[PDB]
Design a protein around this ligand. Sequence first.
Ligand SMILES: [Zn+2]
Length: 259
Amino acid sequence: PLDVVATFSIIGDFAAKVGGDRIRLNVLVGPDSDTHVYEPRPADAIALAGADVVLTNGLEFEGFLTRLIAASGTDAAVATLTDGVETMEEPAHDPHAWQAVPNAKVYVQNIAAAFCAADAEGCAAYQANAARYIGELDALDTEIRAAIAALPQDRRTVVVAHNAFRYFEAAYGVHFLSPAAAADVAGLIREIRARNASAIFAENISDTRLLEQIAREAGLPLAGTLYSDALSGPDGPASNYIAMMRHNAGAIAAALAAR
Ligand SMILES: [Zn+2]
C-alpha cells in the first residue's frame, strides 16, 4: 500500500479517486479549515516522515510545506499538482486553480503520474481511476457552463469572504467581490452598489464576521455558504470536490436568479 500525504482536503479527495484501495491516505489540513493560516502540528511531521508520496498544490498555497519537509526529514516524492495548469497572476500566482474544473483534470492527471512514479505495478489501475473521474469532471464542467449561460448577463456578481474564485470567474463568467484587509467596508459597499451585486455568501473556512455586517449595510440577503478552500465534513453538503462545485454552482445560480 502506497503511503500518501495530501496537504489539504480538496487534493485529498482527488487522491482518493485516483488511488482507490491501493493507497493509504493522510490529509494534513482538514475540512472547513484554512490552509493560508495553517501551522503544522508535530503529528504532521510524523505523517510526512512515513510517506512515499506527498501531494501539494504549489503556487505558495502551503507556506508551511518546505519547513515541514526538512523538519520531518522525509524522502518522499513531492508532486506539485498545479504543474501544467494555466495559472493567473494575483492582484506571485493565484493558487486557487481548482475553482475551474478543467484545472482539476490536470491535478488528477498529475496525481496519477505521481502514483505511477512510486508504484509502477499499479499504474494501469491509477490511470483507469483517473480517466473515469475525469469523465465525471468533464460533465460537471458542462453542467456549470450551461447553468451560468442560462442567466441574464446583467446580474453576475456575488460577494464572498476572500478572493478565492478568480479561476471560477475566468472559466464561467461570475464576478466575485470580497472584503480585503484594513476597514474599507464603505469602499466595498460602494462597489457592491456599482456592480449591482445580487448576494453575499459566507465561506466554510472563515468566521461569518463582516459578511453578515456587509449584507445588512448593503441591503442584500446573506444567501448561504460557498466552499472555497476546503471541503465540508463528511455529512456536510461538500464532502467531495464534485459535490462542492455543484453546491457552489447551484447556490450562486439561485442567488443570481432572484432579482
Ligand atoms: Zn484561499
